[PDB]
Amino acid sequence: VAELTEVRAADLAALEFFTGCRPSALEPLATQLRPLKAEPGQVLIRQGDPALTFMLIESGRVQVSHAVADGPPIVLDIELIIGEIALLRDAPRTATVVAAEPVIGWVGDRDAFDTILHLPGMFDRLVRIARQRLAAFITPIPVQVRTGEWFYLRPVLPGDVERTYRRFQSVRKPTRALLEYLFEVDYADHFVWVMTEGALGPVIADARFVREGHNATMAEVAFTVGDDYQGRGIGSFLMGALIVSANYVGVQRFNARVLTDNMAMRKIMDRLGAVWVREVVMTEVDVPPVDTVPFEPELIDQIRDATRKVIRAVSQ
Ligand SMILES: [Ca+2]
Ligand SMILES: [Ca+2]
Ligand SMILES: [Hg+2]
């Protein structure tokens, strides 16, 4: 009888992931998931495959590796959710995941993941999981701004409110939730630098470029500085970081549109060749060589290393 759905929903409701969930609320999801039981050494996701599913892991460690044509595979480890970014992007697998122990869990397709994303509270829980995974790839950098104050530079993390359907015309039949979740793990089409107070402290400013379209050479820039933090050189510092990444990813021109009595954004843009025009004022500028950012070569390299690390971590 099809009451195996009922046993399955109770199994789902027993996960830390679904803490506080009522098993009945999970029955429609239970319907869309298939049990997974892999033996140690079993390949869960093969590099080079199309992305057909994601996995929700009840238990067992897995190990991630990326194979190349010029030496041995680069190995890691994610000690909960696997495979979901390439699934929602419809991109091929860029890495292989292997069970390092017995692995028990559940497998679903994109529709099953969209079901999870719409359950109460679960979109934010998925975003915290993505955040924890990414935080492993981020080492905040202590930076000294013009005034001598010390702050910390890092890429944005999923769930930073600073992060918030343009470029995502590459996803078929999407929902808003699917697109919002992808927005939280996009670093290539939309790169955001953040400045924090303390290495594990609050974000007090952010700067970003948003490409005009997927892979496009023109991007809209936008800096935001906490009311207390203007004048202090934080904005122009983030601007430097953004050239390193923009240069690194292929963006070649920046553009801006701001409210006119917003003089501080204006001065950030006046700082390279900005020529405003009314509408709200407008302007658009070239992307200067990495040679030309006023940072020590050491700082520049840590910024490019950070950029690279997060983009790869999101399979871009
Ligand atoms: Ca962090
Ligand atoms: Ca698609
Ligand atoms: Hg729930």
Residue 140 · residue 152 · CB < 8 Å? yes
Tokens 């679903």 locate to: 108
Residue 123 structure tokens: 């979109």
Give the orientation angle of helix 110-118 with respect to helix 176-184, to 10 degrees.
90
- Cα of 186 vs centre of ligand 2, distance in Å, is 16
β-strand partners of 107: 34, 55
Tokens 């970081």 locate to: 241
Q: Is 1 annotated as a binding residue?
A: no
Sheet holding 34-38, edge to edge: 34-38, 103-108, 54-59, 81-82
Domains of the chain in start order, with CATH, are 1-140 (2.60.120.10), 141-316 (3.40.630.30)
Residue 153 · residue 141 · CB < 8 Å? yes
- Cα of 34 vs centre of ligand 2, distance in Å, is 21
Tokens 């122009």 locate to: 236
- Cα of 139 vs centre of ligand 1, distance in Å, is 6
Q: How far apart are CA 12 and CA 27, in angstroms?
A: 9
Q: What are phi and psi of 152, to 5 degrees?
A: -120, 130
Residues with CB under 5 A from ligand 2 (ion): 90, 172
For the CA of 110, the nearest ligand = 2
Nearest CA to 212 out of 123, 150, 260, 284 is that of: 284
Residues counted in the chain: 316
- Cα of 171 vs centre of ligand 2, distance in Å, is 4
Q: Is 201 annotated as a binding residue?
A: no
Residue 145 structure tokens: 């701004």
For the CA of 30, the nearest ligand = 3
103-108 and 34-38 as β-strands: parallel, antiparallel, unpaired?
A: antiparallel
- Cα of 141 vs centre of ligand 1, distance in Å, is 10
- Cα of 135 vs centre of ligand 1, distance in Å, is 5
Experimental method: X-ray
Tokens 């935001």 locate to: 224
Residue 146 structure tokens: 């013009």
β-strand partners of 207: 193, 223
Say how far residue 279 (Cα) sits from the centre of its chain: 33
Q: Is 235 annotated as a binding residue?
A: yes
Residue 37 · residue 11 · CB < 8 Å? no
Could you write out the DSSP letters of every residue in the chain? -TTHHHHHHHHHHTSGGGTT--GGGGHHHHTT-EEEEE-TT-EEE-TTS----EEEEEE--EEEEE--SSSSPEE-----EESHHHHHHT----SEEEESS-EEEEEE-HHHHHHHHHSTTHHHHHHHHHHHHHHTT---EEEE-TTS-EEEEEE--TT-GGG---TTTTSSS--HHHHHHHHHT--SSEEEEEEESSTTS-EEEEEEEEESSTT-SEEEEEEEE-GGGTTTTHHHHHHHHHHHHHHHHT--EEEEEE-TT-HHHHHHHHTTT---EE--EEEEEE---GGGSSS-HHHHHHHHHHHHHHHHHTT-
Residue 212 · residue 118 · CB < 8 Å? no
Question: In 10 A of CB 119, how many CB atoms?
Answer: 16
185 Cβ contact partners less than 8 Å away, ≥ 6 residues apart: 85, 130, 134, 158, 314
Q: Is 273 annotated as a binding residue?
A: no
Question: In 10 A of CB 137, how many CB atoms?
Answer: 17
Tokens 């240069």 locate to: 247
C-alpha gyration radius of the chain: 22
- Cα of 174 vs centre of ligand 3, distance in Å, is 22
- Cα of 315 vs centre of ligand 2, distance in Å, is 16
126 Cβ contact partners less than 8 Å away, ≥ 6 residues apart: 81, 116, 117, 181
- Cα of 126 vs centre of ligand 2, distance in Å, is 20
Buried residues in 52-66 as b, exposed as e (16+ CB within 10 A):
ebbbbbbebebbbee
For the CA of 126, the nearest ligand = 3
Nearest CA to 281 out of 264, 268, 266, 294 is that of: 266
253-258 and 218-225 as β-strands: parallel, antiparallel, unpaired?
A: parallel
- Cα of 57 vs centre of ligand 3, distance in Å, is 17
Q: How far apart are CA 81 and CA 253, in angstroms?
A: 36
Nearest CA to 315 out of 88, 108, 140 is that of: 88
- Cα of 83 vs centre of ligand 3, distance in Å, is 21
For the CA of 122, the nearest ligand = 3
Q: Which amino acid appears at position 126 of this protein?
A: L
Nearest CA to 55 out of 34, 77, 78 is that of: 34
β-strand partners of 220: 210, 255
